[PDB]
RNA sequence: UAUACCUCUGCU
RNA sequence: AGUAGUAACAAGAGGG
């Protein structure tokens, strides 16, 4: 259930399963900037 | 034997039967009595009390929970974008783009009861535009000879209020096989 | 159970004849109307649309 | 005033303010109780993440950059001002990965270093009168409710301030001036449009002539 | 582990009745039951709710201790959940047991004029048999 | 206009 | 011709 858009639902979701993935989990620091620019990248695009 | 009645709206000749003559043979008559239809509607809620009040008291209930995904679910609807039978879903998602396309977005919100107020509202547009298609035929080289092509494109029209209205109070006919 | 020992019971085993093509969309509305009596009007006024349009209804 | 959020705020806290309002029955023509309320909510949050960042091992820094850049992260993250679904999906893998305790109503921010949910709830009431309102209610589980004043006064859970004195002064002349501009500045609806009333008026038994009438009957 | 005893052959009377068709459901309603298949299967991604009773907290480490590292789609993991945990029911007719390991067999130990005595695996319910013994 | 071919379709 | 039966199939559409 959502009012949101779904790229919007998706961008929201990319960020943060990056976050937790790395501050405690088995993901490398340079892969959050990694998604976050991309992320920020598809933010720019609309 | 009923009360024939041109319709305000779309000009439809209505004939309307209830509460008109008795019959006087066993041929199949539909001259329902409305003071009779209650009296036994009546009958049936005095016989299981509290009926009416939980049965609407659940129906309420539904329709606050109702979304509009709902009526993805079923049996195929007739489609007034194509005037043409279409799955429940795409004769949904069909609906919601041109009332979308037009000014009604209620729905949005995602509960059923605001795409039902959409539908209302719908019937006071007296210019109602619907996207067509038509085949159009090209042609293009190819190697080193020319070759007709089949290609598709769209076509914007507008309806009158009644061409908009006969359409949504259609409902499809077909053999039963 | 509720007869008495001198009571009859026949059946009618069954059958309406043009059943649809005599069940009309006013008298629809009554039952609705009848059924929800009480309600809030919002509630009676958004079950009665569809027997309404029934009355309306035009086939292709 | 309804053009209290629009000349103040920068552009972008407007289209949130939009957001998940339009759901229940008013809009921003109605009401002046909780229209803009619900804008210094995101506001507050901003300044609560902005400028405050963790290092490598795990302890503080208040940088001036603010784009975090590979080795340092965010400090706070925004729950308040998203979808409901989206809502609980922030509080829960936060909560998988530290077992934690799981509210039961929404919070509105999470402290990375710290491990504290925190409710934003600040109004022209004092400290007392809020503060005890939600805390013999919301009891048993540590969320850390922060009562600020519209003033300056503050009253925190043990005065265990997390956040550092320099930003936190900063938060009060934000509130101190926008307190200064009040003085100067369950319903369901369904009803026929006129179009199907008049075909609602046309499909009843033949005495009647009205569909307002015949439901009287 | 079911074992056969001899086949009866007598007018056999069937009382249609509304029973069990899912022997070894955890009784839970459908909105519990999503609780407790949100939590195994998608367990980032559940809402507000939480669990609320010892039934849904027991099921739920359980099924997460036993389906834990098995290569299936999730779809199909919370469609069977699904149709275990919830109970769901029938009118059929019925001669003799009305218990959900008898329902699940009735083809196999009734005919229209025969019994195949059977009892399934397992051992019965001390309610199905304290309710027998009174009878 | 006929005769060959070629392409799509076999519940839409 | 034949299928069939209250109306169809006995190829339809296109390269026009």
């Known amino acids: 259930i959502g009012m949101a858009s779904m790229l919007d639902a998706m961008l929201s979701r990319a960020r943060i399963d990056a976050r937790i993935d790395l501050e405690s989990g088995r993901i490398s620091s340079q892969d959050f900037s990694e998604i976050t620019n991309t992320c920020k990248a598809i933010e720019a695009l609309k | 034997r009923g009360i024939w009645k041109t319709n305000s709206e779309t000009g439809a000749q209505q004939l309307n039967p209830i509460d008109g003559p008795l019959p006087e043979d066993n041929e199949p008559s539909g001259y329902a009595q409305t003071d009779c239809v209650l009296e036994l509607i009546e009958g049936l809620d005095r016989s299981h009390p509290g009926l009416f009040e939980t049965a609407c008291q659940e129906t309420i209930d539904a329709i606050q929970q109702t979304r509009v995904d709902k009526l993805t679910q079923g049996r195929q609807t007739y489609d007034w974008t194509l005037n043409r039978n279409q799955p429940a879903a795409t004769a949904l998602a069909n609906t919601i783009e041109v009332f979308r396309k037009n000014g009604y977005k209620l729905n949005e919100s995602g509960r059923l009861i605001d795409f039902l107020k959409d539908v209302l509202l719908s019937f006071e547009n007296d210019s109602m535009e619907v996207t067509t298609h038509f085949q159009k035929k090209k042609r293009i080289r190819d190697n080193k000879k020319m070759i007709t092509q089949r290609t598709i494109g769209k076509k914007r029209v507008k309806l009158t209020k009644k061409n908009y209205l006969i359409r949504a109070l259609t409902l499809n006919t077909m053999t039963k096989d | 159970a509720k007869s008495t020992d001198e009571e009859l019971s026949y059946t009618i085993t069954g059958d309406n004849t043009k059943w649809n093509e005599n069940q009309n969309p006013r008298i629809f509305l009554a039952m609705v109307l009848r059924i929800t009596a009480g309600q809030p009007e919002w509630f009676r006024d958004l079950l009665a649309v569809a027997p309404i349009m029934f009355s309306n209804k035009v086939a292709r | 005033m309804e053009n209290f959020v629009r000349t103040n705020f920068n552009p972008m806290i407007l289209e949130r303010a939009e957001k998940t309002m339009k759901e229940y029955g008013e809009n921003p023509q109605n009401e002046g109780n909780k229209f803009a309320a619900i804008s210094t909510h995101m506001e507050v949050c901003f300044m609560y993440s902005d400028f405050h960042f963790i290092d490598l091992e795990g302890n503080t820094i208040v940088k001036e950059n603010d784009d975090d850049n590979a080795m340092l992260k965010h400090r706070f993250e925004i729950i308040e001002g998203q979808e409901r679904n989206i809502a609980w999906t922030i509080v829960n893998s936060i909560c998988n990965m530290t077992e934690n305790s799981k509210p039961r109503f929404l919070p509105d921010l999470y402290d990375y270093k710290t491990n504290k949910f925190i409710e934003i709830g600040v109004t022209r009431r004092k400290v007392e009168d809020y503060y005890y309102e939600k805390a013999s209610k919301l009891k048993g589980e540590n969320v850390y409710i922060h009562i600020f004043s519209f003033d300056g006064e503050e009253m925190a859970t043990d005065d265990e301030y997390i956040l550092d004195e320099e930003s936190r002064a900063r938060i009060k002349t934000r509130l101190f001036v926008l307190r200064q501009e009040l003085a100067t500045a369950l319903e369901e609806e369904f009803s026929y449009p006129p179009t199907f009333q008049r075909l609602a008026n046309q499909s009843l038994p033949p005495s009647f002539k009205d569909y307002h009438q015949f439901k009287a009957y | ?135």
């Open chain 5, 1 to 135: 582990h079911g074992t056969f005893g001899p086949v009866k052959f007598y007018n056999q009377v069937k009382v249609r009745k509304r029973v069990d068709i899912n022997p070894g459901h955890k009784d839970l309603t459908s909105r519990e039951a999503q609780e407790v298949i949100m939590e195994v299967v998608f367990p980032n991604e559940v809402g507000a709710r939480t669990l609320s009773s010892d039934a849904q907290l027991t099921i739920t480490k359980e099924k997460k201790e036993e389906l834990k590292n098995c290569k299936i789609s999730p779809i199909m993991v919370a469609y069977m959940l699904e149709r275990e945990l919830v109970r769901r029911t029938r009118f059929l007719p019925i001669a003799g047991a009305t218990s959900s390991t008898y329902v699940e067999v009735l083809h196999l130990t009734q005919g229209t004029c025969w019994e195949q005595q059977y009892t399934p695996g397992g051992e019965a319910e001390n309610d199905d048999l304290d309710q027998t013994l009174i009878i």
